[PDB]
Amino acid sequence: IQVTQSPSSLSASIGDTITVACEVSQDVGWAVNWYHQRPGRPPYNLIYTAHNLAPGVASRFRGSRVGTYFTLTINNLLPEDVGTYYCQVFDSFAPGGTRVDLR
Amino acid sequence: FLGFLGAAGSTMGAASMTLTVQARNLLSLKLTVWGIKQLQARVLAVERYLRDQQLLGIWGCSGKLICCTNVPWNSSWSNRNLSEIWDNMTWLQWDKEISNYTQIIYGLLEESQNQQEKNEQDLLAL
Amino acid sequence: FLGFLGAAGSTMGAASMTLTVQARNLLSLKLTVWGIKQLQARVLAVERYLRDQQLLGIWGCSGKLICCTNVPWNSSWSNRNLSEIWDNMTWLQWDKEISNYTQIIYGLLEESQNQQEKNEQDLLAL
Amino acid sequence: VRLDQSGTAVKKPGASVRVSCRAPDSFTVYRPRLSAYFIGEFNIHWLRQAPGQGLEWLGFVNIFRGAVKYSSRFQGRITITRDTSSETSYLDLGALKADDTATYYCAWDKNVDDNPWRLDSWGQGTLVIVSS
Amino acid sequence: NLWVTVYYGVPVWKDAETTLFCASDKHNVWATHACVPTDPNPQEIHLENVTEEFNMWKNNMVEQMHTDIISLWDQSLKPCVKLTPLCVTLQCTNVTNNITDDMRGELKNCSFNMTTELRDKKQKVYSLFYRLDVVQINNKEYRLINCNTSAITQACPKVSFEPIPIHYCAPAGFAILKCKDKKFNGTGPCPSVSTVQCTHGIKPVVSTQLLLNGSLAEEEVMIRSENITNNAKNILVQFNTPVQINCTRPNNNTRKSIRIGPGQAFYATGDIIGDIRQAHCNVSKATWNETLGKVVKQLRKHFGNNTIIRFANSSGGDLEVTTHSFNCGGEFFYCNTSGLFNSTWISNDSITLPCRIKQIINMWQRIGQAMYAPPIQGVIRCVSNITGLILTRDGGSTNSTTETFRPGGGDMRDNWRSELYKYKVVKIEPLGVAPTRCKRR
Amino acid sequence: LINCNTSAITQACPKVSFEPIPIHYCAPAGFAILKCKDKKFNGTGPCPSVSTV
Amino acid sequence: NNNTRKSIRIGPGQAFYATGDIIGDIRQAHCNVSKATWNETLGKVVKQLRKHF
Amino acid sequence: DDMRGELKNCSFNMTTELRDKKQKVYSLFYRLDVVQINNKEYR
Ligand SMILES: *[C@@H]1O[C@H](CO)[C@@H](O[C@@H]2O[C@H](CO)[C@@H](O[C@@H]3O[C@H](CO)[C@@H](O)[C@H](O)[C@@H]3O)[C@H](O)[C@H]2NC(C)=O)[C@H](O)[C@H]1NC(C)=O
Ligand SMILES: *[C@@H]1O[C@H](CO)[C@@H](O[C@@H]2O[C@H](CO)[C@@H](O)[C@H](O)[C@H]2NC(C)=O)[C@H](O)[C@H]1NC(C)=O
Ligand SMILES: *[C@@H]1O[C@H](CO)[C@@H](O[C@@H]2O[C@H](CO)[C@@H](O)[C@H](O)[C@H]2NC(C)=O)[C@H](O)[C@H]1NC(C)=O
Ligand SMILES: *[C@@H]1O[C@H](CO)[C@@H](O[C@@H]2O[C@H](CO)[C@@H](O)[C@H](O)[C@H]2NC(C)=O)[C@H](O)[C@H]1NC(C)=O
Ligand SMILES: *[C@@H]1O[C@H](CO)[C@@H](O[C@@H]2O[C@H](CO)[C@@H](O)[C@H](O)[C@H]2NC(C)=O)[C@H](O)[C@H]1NC(C)=O
Ligand SMILES: *[C@@H]1O[C@H](CO)[C@@H](O[C@@H]2O[C@H](CO)[C@@H](O)[C@H](O)[C@H]2NC(C)=O)[C@H](O)[C@H]1NC(C)=O
Ligand SMILES: *[C@@H]1O[C@H](CO)[C@@H](O[C@@H]2O[C@H](CO)[C@@H](O)[C@H](O)[C@H]2NC(C)=O)[C@H](O)[C@H]1NC(C)=O
Ligand SMILES: *[C@@H]1O[C@H](CO)[C@@H](O)[C@H](O)[C@H]1NC(C)=O
Ligand SMILES: *[C@@H]1O[C@H](CO)[C@@H](O)[C@H](O)[C@H]1NC(C)=O
Ligand SMILES: *[C@@H]1O[C@H](CO)[C@@H](O)[C@H](O)[C@H]1NC(C)=O
Ligand SMILES: *[C@@H]1O[C@H](CO)[C@@H](O)[C@H](O)[C@H]1NC(C)=O
Ligand SMILES: *[C@@H]1O[C@H](CO)[C@@H](O)[C@H](O)[C@H]1NC(C)=O
Ligand SMILES: *[C@@H]1O[C@H](CO)[C@@H](O)[C@H](O)[C@H]1NC(C)=O
Ligand SMILES: *[C@@H]1O[C@H](CO)[C@@H](O)[C@H](O)[C@H]1NC(C)=O
Ligand SMILES: *[C@@H]1O[C@H](CO)[C@@H](O)[C@H](O)[C@H]1NC(C)=O
Ligand SMILES: *[C@@H]1O[C@H](CO)[C@@H](O)[C@H](O)[C@H]1NC(C)=O
Ligand SMILES: *[C@@H]1O[C@H](CO)[C@@H](O)[C@H](O)[C@H]1NC(C)=O
Ligand SMILES: *[C@@H]1O[C@H](CO)[C@@H](O)[C@H](O)[C@H]1NC(C)=O
Ligand SMILES: *[C@@H]1O[C@H](CO)[C@@H](O)[C@H](O)[C@H]1NC(C)=O
Ligand SMILES: *[C@@H]1O[C@H](CO)[C@@H](O)[C@H](O)[C@H]1NC(C)=O
Ligand SMILES: *[C@@H]1O[C@H](CO)[C@@H](O)[C@H](O)[C@H]1NC(C)=O
Ligand SMILES: *[C@@H]1O[C@H](CO)[C@@H](O)[C@H](O)[C@H]1NC(C)=O
Ligand SMILES: *[C@@H]1O[C@H](CO)[C@@H](O)[C@H](O)[C@H]1NC(C)=O
Ligand SMILES: *[C@@H]1O[C@H](CO)[C@@H](O)[C@H](O)[C@H]1NC(C)=O
Ligand SMILES: *[C@@H]1O[C@H](CO)[C@@H](O)[C@H](O)[C@H]1NC(C)=O
């Protein structure tokens, strides 16, 4: 299985609403996990099963599934959300990730 | 609607109007203390329900919330006027003042049911 | 004759013709794991049967496999034609599409039975 | 669950590296009907991140009896083992190449059928540097 | 118009969970005597017109079986001698009399002080322990392996470990739906539902890599997996034909009773009469090749025709997973089975599998308790059928069509899914309401 | 102790009395116990005088 | 006291959890109750207790 | 001042994994858990 996620990078101002895409090559159902990695910090689980929030994650995080097209939507962006995003499908990690930084 | 034992303090007629709500609540792991207590409670509840259902069945009133019979009421049990009983009395006092005569009433009920059923069979056969 | 759940996929009328064969199979050592499992299964079967018997009894339908009532059909639960229902449908789908309206129907049956019995009381008394 | 890993390691090409990952008091579960502490069927995943790159999956071990699944990009020089007594997991990578410089993370997987490959908890990360 | 009519005993069922009691047709570990005697003629009823959804992976019956088996295994161990005094310093020497090349160092001749019947009195006895049972302490000094983090309790010698078939029978008001479709994979609707009072004879065999003594597929080899795309879910393989397996323990073992206290006996391992050879399980080469050919033929469907399927041995882990472990006449084997999953596939002779013996067994991985299997007198020998496989596909790059499959296991639930795949538990709901032209008088 | 090579003993707790107390074995509901009242009843064959308890 | 739990293995799978050395100063375990709150509660209690005496 | 004598630093011979082998280890016990026997000997 091959997983692709885009855009490679994006810059948003404080409070904006941004979304990140994660496309899968085959139907995998809802088995998509979303991970947050702050710079110089270990990654932590953000969304599991593509629409369920991890414990401690604010309700402003939302994930959705459209067939083989998965989206993670960010509301009212805040400075601590800076970093890179990774989507996981089984043993496959999307190359590069999506770096999100303040504008 | 008031709920389980909602009309406990009501008058006789009002309480009888809602017999179903009290009628529907008589029936509703390892060998741990909580588990064994749960099992004992379950068996006690089911046996109590079936004792009551069997006792109704003997008098030929199974399936009927309010059922009439053919034994006269001796005034020795209670000579109170009907209007006072059914409009100015609750079931608690009523059971309080007939606790002793209950067994003979039950026996009369059983005998009357048996005799009536035998007569019905005789009429059905002829 | 087909057996327990023999007419599960059959039509409504054929299934109704043979309710008895599923009706009879609703009811039929130390403290070892197998023993305790057997005992819990036995008690569970007893209570599962008795809940259904109580529900039938409240509606004034104890002892009758088929019982008619005085609750009008609201037509919002299902407006399907009688011929379609009773000749081109199975009980499984029928229960599938009334899974939500069951409780209100049960309550209507209970209240209708209660009022009906008390009405009978008045006539038997007069 | 808290995860603790070993410290930074310095290695030469062709050597071998062992990084430890301890998950205290998390290897055991209490099956209530069975009335004892059993070793749960958890998975410990091992991941690494090259400097400035994305994440890559190495392999995971099943705590129950040590079942291991390895990424084909590392088969033949990778070995993941766990010690149920010490509640630790060991990554043993052999024939290290200069491109293996990365922060190696050990991750905790509850192995829930409804959530495949959930990496709930992560260690602080271990820097492994290889050079001549 | 219309009126509500209540019906009793309608054939309506809902998926539900309930406790299932045992029924079965010397004392055994599973306490099959406690199971109620099953009817000599089981009643099976065909439910035509019925299409019921099945899902063995979310079935409760496997979990309930797991709980019941572990509970039975624990309960059969309580009235047995506890070998807590065995955790004493051992003086073990190499056994080098009439041993073969492969047997060098696998057995140890350990002598130790042991508590006599009189508490103050002590005695020096000797016993034979396999190398996997004793660990060196740093002739040399050894100790029983689990003595560090487990209490030893000897399995009672008189209880048989043989799997007696057991039938899981649901109580009254519940039914068991059997999927009679011969081409049914583990999920999806099964349009051949037939109800039975309870399941056929289930043998709770404990094996890791090869499914022994199991039930065969009716038509062809089946490949059942929850998510064939997920390279972490075990792949349940079922054989349409049985693959026979000879094996035995060639050593003429003798059970020597050592009285370690008041009414407490520890059964040691005495001197072996004759030469000492290697325990080994035989599989017919041609039969295994044919079965592997059928398996790979049925496995190309889920991956493609042009893909390369290669069978490799276990990748590592504890001995129970790396080897094919099972019980045979009271002894627990650990067979290499590297010659089985060794070939690669593209578009009279027997395979000898060197097995190893253990006496300290820690099945179910319970913290604090372990079992000591008493030695079996004489030469044990059992013949079984390999009726299944536990294959775990590896990952791979996107530039390769080579899908490597390796034996897996460990999770006994996966072993018991291959026997409860065609069954499910439903709750009879006999109350039905339907409009009718009848109105109560 | 003669036990020491064949069995392990547990001391009977001194406070429990071994004295026999009469105990009646009562059948559950739906079952009855038939008591043979024949004074010349040898234990086998019919008992002409049967009383239930 | 910042106590340390030291595991002492007294047998097969049996662990006796002992008390290790205490890090830092060793003080007295104590409970704290507000003086004013306790006095007010005692006043209410004594007011309600004068009724029966 | 208030903690004087409330703790006891007790060291004792204890059995180990290997039954024949003994072992010496120490632990801290509160004064209310140990009673003198008539450093001193306690139990
Ligand atoms: C799969 O099923 C076969 C057949 O039931 C099992 O083989 C059987 O194994 C038992 C013990 O493992 C044998 O019983 C023993 O027989 C010897 C010789 O008669 C006797 O001395 C012992 O006291 C004991 O009764 C039994 O004969 C044997 N059946 C055969 C060879 O036909 C096999 O063990 C099963 N596979 C498993 C459990 O993995
Ligand atoms: C992979 O596994 C997941 C989870 O086991 C499957 O997801 C389920 O899909 C069914 C489809 O009918 C849904 O009803 C469930 O709600 C899903 N469960 C989840 C997401 O936890 C998925 O279908 C499987 N996919 C493949 C290709 O095997
Ligand atoms: C398993 O097969 C091997 C050979 O494939 C058998 O080993 C032979 O055993 C006979 C005795 O019956 C010896 O005469 C031969 O010399 C052995 N051949 C060897 C060692 O290469 C073995 O007996 C079989 N085990 C069974 C059937 O349980
Ligand atoms: C497993 O052992 C059985 C013996 O019980 C083998 O069955 C024998 O096979 C030989 C062929 O070499 C026949 O000549 C005998 O008549 C068979 N005896 C029977 C059926 O009782 C069986 O072949 C062995 N399995 C393997 C794979 O070697
Ligand atoms: C699977 O097969 C491989 C090779 O066929 C085994 O690798 C051998 O492992 C032993 C250790 O016991 C080494 O001494 C050999 O040099 C290895 N051979 C190689 C790498 O070619 C591997 O052990 C087998 N796995 C199991 C579980 O038996
Ligand atoms: C399982 O069997 C394989 C091969 O039969 C073993 O691998 C061999 O191990 C020996 C031991 O030194 C090596 O000399 C060989 O080079 C290995 N490969 C082959 C092809 O023979 C393997 O070790 C066995 N697994 C065990 C014993 O656990
Ligand atoms: C017991 O402790 C609690 C919290 O440690 C104390 O509550 C605090 O009291 C201070 C006043 O001294 C306030 O400034 C804080 O805002 C309180 N915090 C909380 C969370 O309640 C409480 O006063 C203490 N009581 C006593 C009797 O010592
Ligand atoms: C309680 O008593 C009052 C007055 O006697 C009466 O009006 C009321 O109906 C009674 N409660 C019920 C539930 O009947
Ligand atoms: C199954 O359906 C067919 C037609 O739909 C019907 O003739 C048949 O009787 C049904 N099966 C049973 C057992 O009634
Ligand atoms: C084991 O050692 C004992 C002496 O302690 C000896 O009598 C016995 O023959 C030895 N057995 C083997 C198989 O070496
Ligand atoms: C005795 O067996 C051990 C295996 O545990 C082996 O390492 C050792 O070399 C053997 N001793 C001799 C003298 O062969
Ligand atoms: C048994 O105890 C004696 C006592 O010193 C010792 O010499 C001997 O080596 C012991 N035997 C063992 C540990 O096997
Ligand atoms: C017990 O000792 C053995 C000796 O090799 C060791 O492998 C094991 O980890 C130890 N268990 C503990 C310390 O819990
Ligand atoms: C299992 O069977 C169902 C129904 O035939 C089918 O939809 C599905 O693709 C099959 N395979 C899996 C892995 O579910
Ligand atoms: C093993 O297979 C044979 C046929 O090869 C069969 O007769 C026997 O019953 C099977 N044993 C089982 C299933 O336990
Ligand atoms: C095993 O040894 C005993 C001697 O104790 C002998 O009677 C028996 O025949 C032997 N069995 C075999 C298969 O050689
Ligand atoms: C098994 O069959 C394959 C089919 O290609 C063949 O290559 C291989 O040599 C066979 N192995 C045997 C007969 O042992
Ligand atoms: C596995 O197969 C290779 C050739 O395909 C062979 O050289 C090797 O000996 C085999 N391993 C065994 C038989 O254990
Ligand atoms: C126990 O000892 C007595 C003599 O003291 C002896 O007669 C008996 O056989 C012994 N029982 C055993 C060794 O089981
Ligand atoms: C008891 O009396 C009966 C009377 O019929 C007789 O048949 C039977 O043999 C007698 N039994 C004995 C032991 O005398
Ligand atoms: C107690 O000691 C530990 C070190 O063993 C330390 O991490 C912790 O902060 C200490 N607690 C307090 C309250 O000082
Ligand atoms: C408690 O409060 C009362 C009134 O406020 C006062 O008279 C008394 O002295 C107080 N006592 C204490 C101990 O505070
Ligand atoms: C030791 O502690 C005890 C407390 O039980 C105390 O009485 C005694 O004076 C202490 N001795 C010294 C030397 O501190
Ligand atoms: C208790 O005594 C031991 C030596 O037996 C010592 O190592 C330890 O530090 C002491 N603990 C105290 C004084 O708190
Ligand atoms: C342990 O036993 C030795 C043996 O003499 C003794 O010297 C020592 O004091 C003992 N340790 C204690 C009692 O703590």
Numbering used by the authors:
A (entry chain M): 2 to 91, 96 to 108
B (entry chain D), C (entry chain B): 519 to 546, 566 to 663
D (entry chain I): 2 to 35, 35A, 35B, 35C, 35D, 35E, 35F, 35G, ...
E (entry chain A): 33 to 57, 65 to 138, 147 to 185, 188 to 306, 309 to 321, 321A, 322 to 397, 411 to 504
F (entry chain E): 193 to 245
G (entry chain C): 300 to 306, 309 to 321, 321A, 322 to 353
H (entry chain C): 148 to 185, 188 to 192
Quote the original article.
From 831 expressed monoclonal antibodies, we identified 04_A06, a VH1-2-encoded broadly neutralizing antibody to the CD4 binding site with remarkable breadth and potency against multiclade pseudovirus panels (geometric mean half-maximal inhibitory concentration = 0.059 µg ml−1, breadth = 98.5%, 332 strains). 04_A06 contains an 11-amino-acid insertion in the framework region heavy chain 1 (FWRH1) that contacts highly conserved Env residues (>99%), providing a structural explanation for its remarkable antiviral activity. In each structure, R71 of the heavy chain contacts D368 of gp120, a feature typical of VRC01-class antibodies and a hallmark of CD4-mimetic bnAbs12. Additionally, the VH1-2-encoded heavy chain N58 is mutated to K58 in 04_A06 and IOMA, mimicking the interaction of CD4 K35 with Env residues N280 and R456 of gp120. Although 04_A06 features a five-amino-acid-long CDRL3 characteristic of VRC01-class bnAbs, it also shares key somatic hypermutations and structural determinants with IOMA shaping recognition of the CD4bs. Contacts between 04_A06 and the adjacent protomer were mediated exclusively via a protruding CDRH1 in 04_A06, a consequence of the 11-residue FWRH1 insertion, which also contacted the primary protomer. D26 is also positioned adjacent to gp120 R304 (93.5% conserved), whereas residues within the tip of the 04_A06 CDRH1 (heavy chain Y31–Y35C) are in close proximity to residues H66 and H72 on gp120 (99.9% and 96.2% conserved, respectively). Together, these residues could form interactions that permit tolerance to structural variability within the CD4bs on the primary Env protomer (for example, the addition of a potential N-linked glycosylation site at gp120 N279).
Broadly neutralizing antibodies (bnAbs), capable of neutralizing diverse HIV-1 strains and subtypes, represent promising tools for immunotherapy and prevention. bnAbs target conserved epitopes on the HIV-1 Env trimer, including the CD4 binding site (CD4bs), glycan-dependent sites at the V3 base and V2 region, the gp120–gp41 interface, the membrane-proximal external region, the fusion peptide and the silent face. The highly conserved CD4bs is critical for virus engagement of host cells. VRC01-class members, encoded by the immunoglobulin heavy chain gene segment IGHV1-2, include a five-residue light chain complementary-determining region 3 (CDRL3) and are characterized by high somatic hypermutation. To elucidate mechanisms of Env recognition, we determined single-particle cryo-electron microscopy (cryo-EM) structures of a BG505SOSIP.664 trimer unbound (2.9 Å) and in complex with representative Fabs from each expanded B cell clone: 04_A06 (3.8 Å), 01_D03 (3.2 Å) and 05_B08 (3.3 Å).
